[PDB]
């Protein structure tokens, strides 16, 4: 899928990228003349008619008047869409400092590893691992340490054409980390739900308890519906 | 430009600002009567005609029906634009806590210094420095310390009408810091790309290597194009 099980800490070559820092002829004649390539449109508000069957000029005016208002809205909408994106660009740049890989994976619509070298972002590709081999461990306790226990679950996996089985630690977005150095002080009554593939593995007291499908846990409805109402298809009736 | 070389830690007076916490007559007669200031519009769906050349009522209906659907869209679009901005307001407020100056410089479309006093933001103005005098230093290693080296490059500059040359540390958005206390433990094979004005100064092993123009490094395409298609200008032909 978009985010397969992968190791994103082996890539040796990253592509360097940078966030961008920097992101009609009407003459009165109340008649107004608008120049078109093959014609000139004369619009009269009092006339309620546009000049390139008396309705022809009215029908032209109807389309032309709606054309102007809609194209003016599309300009105001565009102007604000840009001022919005210029902000979301600053937000993404700030977010990359907090976490680069997740933000860059979003901007690429594909799992990519990202590291920040000075003011540029080095984007590299991850090493995909066999989905079938990936398997989480029931114990989340660090061996030989009761006080310390892995914050995230350990995963046993293998590379595409490699027989050897590696042991790593599951991260976010199905990203396995070869270094199992993610750990936390053991907490009483600690329950954690970790997503691995299409399953959420529930761990109680740093011990696996149950594996539920993603639908088991409700989804936050962040999406803001625009409720776009498409223009209906009206069949005008002939009258007299 | 929008962000000239500047010192934003000298301002003694900041303006206090706060994020906002809190951000038609149709009567059936299937005829529906809509009251206008100079007239009353009667819309018939079955009739396919609107009453304020049989086309006059149809042409009125065409504009009126599109007027209703488009204005209902512009209302649904607006409602969602607001719910979106109410969220982006919370995001900006959270971002200001992480970094106030960058977020407030974005909200002002101009370089401004910002400090968070309790739940209000003190916005002040920066001290511009001569662009010509600004010059980065090749060495990025703390003197007398091999283990410690400046995380960001040091800059030699001077104030608008001040002959004296100051020594500071380049920050983000062409902001020079008089205090050169930004430093990090020296790392092997460390390569950093730092933006100063319209140039990206590459530093290898805490030593300046090359100065490339901004176009040298690719720009991340965060902008989400709306592909706004403006209404085309159709010249209706007269038929019979």
């Amino acid at each position: 899928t978009s985010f397969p099980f992968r190791v994103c800490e082996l890539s040796s070559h990253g592509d360097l990228f940078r966030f961008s820092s920097d992101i009609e002829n009407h003459t009165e004649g109340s008649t107004i003349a608008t120049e078109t390539g093959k014609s000139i449109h004369f619009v009269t508000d009092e006339g309620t008619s546009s000049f390139v069957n008396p309705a022809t000029v009215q029908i032209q005016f109807a389309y032309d008047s709606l054309r102007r208002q809609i194209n003016r809205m599309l300009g105001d909408l565009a102007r604000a869409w840009c001022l919005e994106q210029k902000r979301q660009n600053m937000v993404l740049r700030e977010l990359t400092k907090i976490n680069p890989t997740t933000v860059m994976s979003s901007i690429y619509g594909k799992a990519v590893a990202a590291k920040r070298l000075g003011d540029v972002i080095s984007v590299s590709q991850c090493v995909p691992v066999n989905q079938a081999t990936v398997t989480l461990r029931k114990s989340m306790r660090v061996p030989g340490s009761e006080t310390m226990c892995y914050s995230r679950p350990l995963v046993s996996f293998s590379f595409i054409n490699d027989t050897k089985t590696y042991e790593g630690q599951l991260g976010t977005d199905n990203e396995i980390f070869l270094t199992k150095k993610m750990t936390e002080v053991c907490q009483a009554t600690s329950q954690y739900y970790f997503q691995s593939g299409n399953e959420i593995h529930v761990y109680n007291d740093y011990h696996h308890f149950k594996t539920i499908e993603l639908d088991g846990i409700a989804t936050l409805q962040t999406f803001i519906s625009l409720n776009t109402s498409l223009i209906e298809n009206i069949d005008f009736a002939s009258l007299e | 430009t929008s962000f000239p070389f500047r010192v934003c830690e000298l301002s003694s007076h900041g303006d206090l600002f706060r994020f906002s916490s809190d951000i038609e007559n149709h009567t059936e007669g299937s005829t529906i009567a809509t009251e206008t200031g100079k007239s009353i519009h009667f819309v018939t769906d079955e009739g396919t005609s609107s009453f304020v050349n049989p086309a006059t009522v149809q042409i009125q209906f065409a504009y009126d029906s599109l007027r209703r659907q488009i204005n209902r869209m512009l209302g649904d679009l607006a409602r969602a634009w607001c719910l979106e901005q109410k969220r982006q307001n919370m995001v900006l407020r959270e971002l200001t806590k992480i970094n106030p100056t960058t977020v407030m410089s974005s909200i002002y479309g101009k370089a401004v210094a910002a400090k968070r006093l309790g739940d209000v933001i003190s916005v002040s103005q920066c001290v511009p420095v001569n662009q010509a005098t600004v010059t980065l230093r090749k060495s990025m290693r703390v003197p007398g310390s091999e283990t410690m080296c400046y995380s960001r490059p040091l800059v030699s500059f001077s104030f608008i009408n001040d002959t004296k040359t100051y020594e500071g540390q380049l920050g983000t958005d062409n902001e020079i810091f008089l205090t050169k206390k930004m430093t990090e433990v020296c790392q092997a094979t460390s390569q950093y790309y730092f933006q100063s004005g319209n140039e990206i100064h590459v530093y290898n092993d805490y030593h300046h290597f090359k100065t490339i123009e901004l176009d040298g490094i690719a720009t991340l395409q965060t902008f989400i194009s709306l592909n706004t298609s403006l209404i085309e200008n159709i010249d209706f032909a007269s038929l019979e």
Partner: antibody, heavy 130, light 107 residues
Framework: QVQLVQSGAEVKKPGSSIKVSCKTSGGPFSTYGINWVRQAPGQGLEWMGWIIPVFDTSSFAQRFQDRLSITADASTSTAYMELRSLRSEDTAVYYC???????????????????????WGQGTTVTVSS | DIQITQSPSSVSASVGDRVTITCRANLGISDWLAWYQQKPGRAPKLLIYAASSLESGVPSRFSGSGSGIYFTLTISSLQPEDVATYFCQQANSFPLSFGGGTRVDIA
């Protein structure tokens, strides 16, 4: 289990050239990288060099940057290291160690040498004497 | 060339006592140091592949820690099979180097 079988002990007269071999069995020889480490008698381990068979990329230590040639034969799944102009100080047990993490995914080089060497070989005692 | 130095040349402890081995570097290895254990006439055996990640098949008593300049290997309880030479290896960038082995011995 990936097993690396090295060549046998060979006493070499000074100024001769020795080429110790290391056969990989039980894993992808080309993808992973083999490091050549030398431990002189009563001395600490000393990295001699490393090569990746798929990209035939061989990095050597400055001391042997001129007299050391590490090669790899995919057909025999064997990596061979040759030391020329042998001197008494060259007497040591040469070790072939395979990197723990994959070093190459297709045509893309990986930093698998950052996780150390897991599989080592028996070791070839090379004595330089006349 | 990054230069690594093991703080203790040799360590003598009683069975059950903890043993700490330090490996410092002139530059930053960024969690790419590996700890190895070598017994007389035997090939070195990797214990901690990462700065702190213990390799499989290694007794939990062996533990690693440290980042960049400082690094550390701790043996919770010294046991008769812990008597060997421990070498720290920089894996950040070629040329890779091994720190002088620390001789752990029964006291």
């Amino acid at each position: 289990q990936v097993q690396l079988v090295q060549s046998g002990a060979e006493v070499k007269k000074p100024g001769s050239s020795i080429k110790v071999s290391c056969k990989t069995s039980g894993g992808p020889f080309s993808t992973y990288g083999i490091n050549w480490v030398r431990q002189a008698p009563g001395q600490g381990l000393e990295w001699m060099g490393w090569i990746i068979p798929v990209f035939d990329t061989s990095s050597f230590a400055q001391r042997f940057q001129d007299r050391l040639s590490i090669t790899a034969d995919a057909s025999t799944s064997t990596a061979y290291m040759e030391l020329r102009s042998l001197r008494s100080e060259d007497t040591a047990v040469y070790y072939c160690a395979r990197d723990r993490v994959l070093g190459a995914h297709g045509a893309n080089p990986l930093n698998g040498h950052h996780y150390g060497m897991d599989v080592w070989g028996q070791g070839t005692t090379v004595t330089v004497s006349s | 060339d990054i230069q690594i130095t093991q703080s203790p040349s040799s360590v003598s402890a009683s069975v059950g006592d903890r043993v700490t081995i330090t490996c410092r570097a002139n530059l930053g290895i960024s969690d790419w140091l590996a700890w190895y254990q070598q017994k007389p006439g035997r090939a070195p055996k990797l214990l901690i592949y990462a700065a702190s990640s213990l390799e499989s098949g290694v007794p939990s008593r062996f533990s690693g820690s440290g980042s960049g300049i400082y690094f550390t290997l701790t043996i919770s309880s010294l046991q008769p099979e812990d008597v060997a030479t421990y070498f720290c290896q920089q894996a950040n960038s070629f040329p890779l180097s091994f720190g002088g082995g620390t001789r752990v011995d029964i006291a």
